[PDB]
Ligand binder design. Structure first.
Ligand SMILES: N#C/C=C/c1cc(F)cc(Oc2ccc(F)cc2OCCn2ccc(=O)[nH]c2=O)c1
Lengths: 428, 549
């Protein structure tokens, strides 16, 4: 191994010290996996053991690659990122291709391994410190720091950006209509090609990267998969927002019209042109909830106007690059979940709904996890950055079980909501 | 004089900071002489060294007499140096819990004497530890010294010592994979399954190694033999328990005494099952005044009595067998208190514990059970590195019904039902759709924020209507009161319509208990009903609303 450049010098933000974060307790299984992995990484010179004079710490976990039987090590760099990358956004920052979200197909490739060839700045290494914990606090943790660009650190692709650019240069020239964006360890490749030739082009890029020295373990089962599916494929052209729908009924009761007036009144927080007057006049008297109420002409006219105004997108909704993205998720039951990515309240940049599968495989936590991953991926493709989730789950529960189903090399920011109200059905 | 060839750990001052400078003149000749007698011997042992006064730094020095005055001790206050020294890795957060230890044929405890002074200090840093022994008046040059080894009370001492010890243990463990060494502070704990002769031989061998590195271990006896009173525990060869708990008798109690009492009870809870701290800790809601004398409530008295009855006879925990399954069992104590036992074999517990819900005004048994499962899962992952199998007082249909309709994602690992009353159940379920042939109650209530008067009432589709006045209430209380009136005056099946998002929020949460009596009564009514449908409408838009104030 040799250093192509010597090191890219890294400084922190003025008035900021290194990350000090507690390492979460781990299963014995995951501890052993991490021990094995790190023993090998130490053997290759990627990481080295450190002394008591290094105060800094970053959490570590063991996940599984995608479906595999082999353990993968995932370091959570969120804090170090905020303490470093905020200054390599400006300085080394990778520009985001707004044309990527317009492509018909987008494949995601894992380029992480590349970073391991490039050494890390000598003075910066102490900030990469992490701890493999011991069960029952029996022994002090095993302490390493990176000698090379770590995966999960946003500074890694930034430093490697030039190398990536010049490696991708020949492929970009023979394929000028293909969009290639790098977010951390991931390469997002868009195209308008037919699915088959799109896959062929992705394989061409794989062989290109490979013969240029970049392993991309997106390689399949070799020839024959039994029932499973190939590399991650997205379709951002179908990724537009969702409108608000009202129930279609042959007969309407007092209750139906009450839920209708309520939901419309809620929708008035978004669309100012909503009028509930003529629908409210029909409920004027005090009646049984199960009493069927025929719709007048005024009320029907009002319902038509409301349905018409509700199917058009919201005016004056734009993305502010200086503001953080916020993704709220609410659980709809029956394997369904709904979400909204916004910046300011009631101005929705994006909304959607996900149902994985029904029964005999997955539970709530698995679904919410996969949901967070999908939403984050969409967010990356569209704005070139991840949102901060408000998760409908108990904090300790999530902190316990999230690593089980996590297939992603990045982690977003999250907080937990114990509150959420009646509005559930209003989003479905 | 055991000087050590131990590789030093490089140490820096915090960036932009210099070494501490403090002049110590005081005080008396006797202390000076004692300091001389000590520092000469410390210098002889290489622990400290006299230095030429070229622009150095200084630290205050004191001499404090212990009981039995035959010996003296020197105390150097390093706080000002500790301010300027770099941060180090955290030393040890928690201790290992006895329930997580494995049974060994032999366990030896080793105390290392003068641990810090046996480990050298980084050369370039040594000058920052400099201090001065004062002359007897007359401003004559003071005696200058500096530490060559880890000073007691210095910020970096325990961590550096820990790493040094680990490195020293490294070659011995390599030649001895069949024994286990736990390092804690100045102590080592060596377990083995080796036969007693072989074990003792190995222990002496270890002692010799340590002595080769400049560390001492007891040659008189070998001292500690089980118990083994360690960190508030009692460690026995086949079992572990807590050290004896003593609950003091008092005619008067302050906040401090209640703090100590509750502490002792919490500590006792990990092994003795059934300990209840709720009523006693509720007295501590007086968090304003810490010296205030607190009178004991009857509930607290009864609870403390129960704890005394529980603590009457000793109980013991066992150790962990990795070859056996791990089971956790939970019971409800009824006051919002929960108790649990973690075990492997039926008549033995690894440990016990309790969960209480301080959080929230309203809650229910199922959610609390889930939270308990969470706490236990975390604790198990910490102690044994695995999650236990659960035995729970809940039917699967109950659980499924709850989590499927719950707005929050929850999950529980592999668990089975055990029938040990009280069982956890759903006491009522609101209808998902309005009930045909049921009287519809349009309810509402309101309060004046100033006068605190307010009122609550309903109007029904059958033309029936009621209004009741209230005193010392709030809008929320009036809305809940309205719903309660509707429940009181209705039949077995009722449709209620409220404009209050709050009240609907409380009811849809399906709480089985509350600290609010009103909500409790509403709950009772809800249990007594066959079918209740609660619906919400926008307020003040006058749809079906109540026009009266
Ligand atoms: N003073 C003092 C005691 C400290 C102490 C603390 C521990 F966490 C463990 C400990 O001893 C053990 C050391 C290594 C092991 F693998 C297991 C240990 O278990 C202690 C329980 N014990 C005690 C005596 C005995 O004959 N068998 C046994 O399992 C001693």
């Amino acid at each position: 191994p040799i250093s192509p450049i010597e090191t890219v010098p890294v400084k922190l933000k003025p008035g900021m010290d290194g990350p000090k974060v507690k390492q979460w307790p781990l299963t014995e299984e995951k501890i052993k996996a991490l021990v094995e992995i790190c023993t090998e990484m130490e053997k290759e010179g990627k990481i080295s053991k450190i002394g008591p004079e290094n105060p800094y710490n970053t959490p570590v976990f063991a996940i599984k690659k995608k479906d595999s039987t082999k353990w993968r090590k995932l370091v959570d760099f969120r804090e170090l990122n905020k303490r470093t990358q905020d200054f390599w956004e400006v300085q080394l920052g990778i520009p985001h291709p707004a044309g990527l979200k317009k492509k018909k197909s987008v494949t995601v490739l894992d380029v992480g391994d590349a970073y391991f060839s490039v050494p890390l700045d000598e003075d910066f290494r102490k900030y990469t410190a992490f701890t493999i914990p011991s069960i029952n606090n029996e022994t002090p943790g095993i302490r390493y720091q990176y000698n090379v660009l770590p995966q999960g650190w946003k500074g890694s692709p930034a430093i490697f950006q030039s190398s990536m650019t010049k490696i991708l240069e020949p492929f970009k020239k023979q394929n000028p209509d293909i969009v290639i964006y790098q977010y951390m360890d991931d390469l997002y490749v868009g195209s308008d090609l037919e699915i088959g030739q799109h896959r062929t082009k992705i394989e061409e890029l794989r062989q290109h990267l490979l013969r240029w020295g970049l392993t991309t373990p997106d390689k399949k089962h070799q020839k024959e998969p039994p029932f499973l599916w190939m590399g991650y494929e997205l379709h951002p052209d179908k990724w537009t927002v969702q409108p608000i729908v009202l129930p279609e009924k042959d007969s309407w009761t007092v209750n139906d019209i009450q839920k209708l007036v309520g939901k419309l009144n809620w929708a008035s927080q978004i669309y100012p042109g909503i009028k509930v007057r003529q629908l409210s006049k029909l409920l004027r008297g005090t009646k049984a909830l199960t009493e069927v109420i025929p719709l007048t002409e005024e009320a029907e006219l009002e319902l038509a106007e409301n349905r018409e105004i509700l199917k058009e997108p919201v005016h004056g909704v734009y993305y502010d690059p200086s503001k953080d993205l916020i993704a709220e998720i609410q659980k709809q039951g029956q394997g369904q979940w709904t979400y909204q990515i916004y910046q300011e309240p009631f101005k929705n940049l994006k909304t959607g709904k996900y149902a994985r599968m029904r029964g005999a495989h997955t539970n709530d936590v698995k679904q919410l996890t996969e949901a967070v991953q999908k939403i984050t991926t969409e967010s990356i493709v569209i704005w070139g950055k991840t949102p901060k989730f408000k998760l409908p789950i108990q904090k300790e529960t999530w902190e316990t079980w999230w690593t089980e189903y996590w297939q992603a090399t990045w982690i977003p920011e999250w907080e937990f909501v114990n509150t959420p109200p009646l509005v559930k059905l209003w989003y479905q | 004089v055991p000087i050590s060839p131990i590789e030093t750990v490089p140490v820096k001052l915090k960036p932009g900071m210099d070494g501490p400078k403090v002049k110590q003149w005081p005080l008396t000749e006797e202390k000076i002489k004692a300091l001389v007698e000590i520092c000469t011997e410390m210098e002889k042992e290489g622990k400290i060294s006299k230095i030429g006064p070229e622009n150095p730094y200084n630290t205050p020095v004191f001499a404090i007499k212990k009981k039995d005055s035959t010996k003296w001790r020197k105390l150097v206050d390093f706080r000002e140096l500790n301010k300027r020294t770099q941060d180090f890795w955290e030393v040890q957060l928690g201790i290992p819990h006895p329930a997580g230890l494995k049974k060994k044929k032999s366990v030896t405890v080793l105390d290392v004497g003068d641990a810090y002074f046996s480990v050298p200090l980084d050369e370039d840093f040594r000058k920052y530890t400099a201090f001065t022994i004062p002359s007897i008046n007359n401003e004559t040059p003071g005696i200058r010294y500096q530490y060559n080894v880890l000073p007691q009370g210095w910020k970096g001492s325990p961590a550096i010592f820990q790493s040094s010890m680990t490195k020293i243990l490294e070659p011995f463990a390599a030649q001895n994979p069949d024994i286990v060494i736990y390092q804690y502070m100045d102590d080592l704990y060596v377990g083995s399954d080796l036969e007693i002769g072989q074990h003792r031989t190995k222990i002496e061998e270890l002692r010799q190694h340590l002595l080769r590195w400049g560390l001492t271990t007891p040659d008189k006896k070998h001292q500690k033999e089980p118990p083994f009173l360690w960190m508030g525990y009692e460690l026995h060869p086949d079992k572990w328990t807590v050290q004896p708990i003593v609950l003091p008798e008092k005619d008067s109690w302050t906040v401090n005494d209640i703090q100590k009492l509750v502490g002792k009870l919490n500590w006792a809870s990990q092994i003795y099952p059934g300990i209840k701290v709720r009523q006693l800790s509720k007295l501590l809601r007086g968090t304003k005044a810490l010296t205030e004398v607190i009178p004991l409530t009857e509930e607290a008295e009864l609870e403390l009595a129960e704890n005394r009855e529980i603590l009457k006879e000793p109980v013991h925990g066992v150790y962990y067998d990795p070859s056996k399954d791990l089971i956790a069992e939970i019971q409800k104590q009824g006051q919002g208190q929960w108790t649990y036992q973690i075990y492997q074999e039926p008549f033995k517990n690894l440990k016990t514990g309790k969960y209480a819900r301080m959080r929230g005004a309203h809650t229910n048994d199922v959610k609390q059970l889930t939270e308990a499962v969470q706490k236990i899962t975390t604790e198990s992952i910490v102690i044994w590195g695995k999650t236990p199998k659960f035995k729970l007082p809940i039917q699967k249909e109950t659980w499924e019904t709850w989590w499927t309709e719950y707005w929050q994602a929850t999950w529980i690992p592999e668990w089975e039902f055990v029938n040990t009353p009280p069982l956890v159940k759903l006491w009522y379920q609101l209808e998902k759709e309005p009930i045909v042939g049921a009287e519809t109650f349009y309810v509402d209530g309101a309060a004046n924020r100033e006068t605190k008067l307010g009122k609550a009432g309903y109007v029904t589709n059958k033309g029936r209507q009621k209004v009741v006045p209230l005193t010392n209430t709030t809008n929320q209380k009036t809305e809940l009161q309205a719903i309660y009136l509707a429940l009181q005056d209705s039949g077995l099946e009722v449709n209620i319509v409220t404009d209050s998002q709050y009240a609907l929020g409380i009811i849809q949460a399906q709480p089985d208990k509350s600290e609010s009596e009103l909500v409790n009564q509403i709950i009772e009514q809800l249990i007594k009903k066959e079918k209740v449908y609660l619906a919400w409408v926008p307020a003040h838009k006058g749809i079906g609303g109540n026009e009266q104030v």
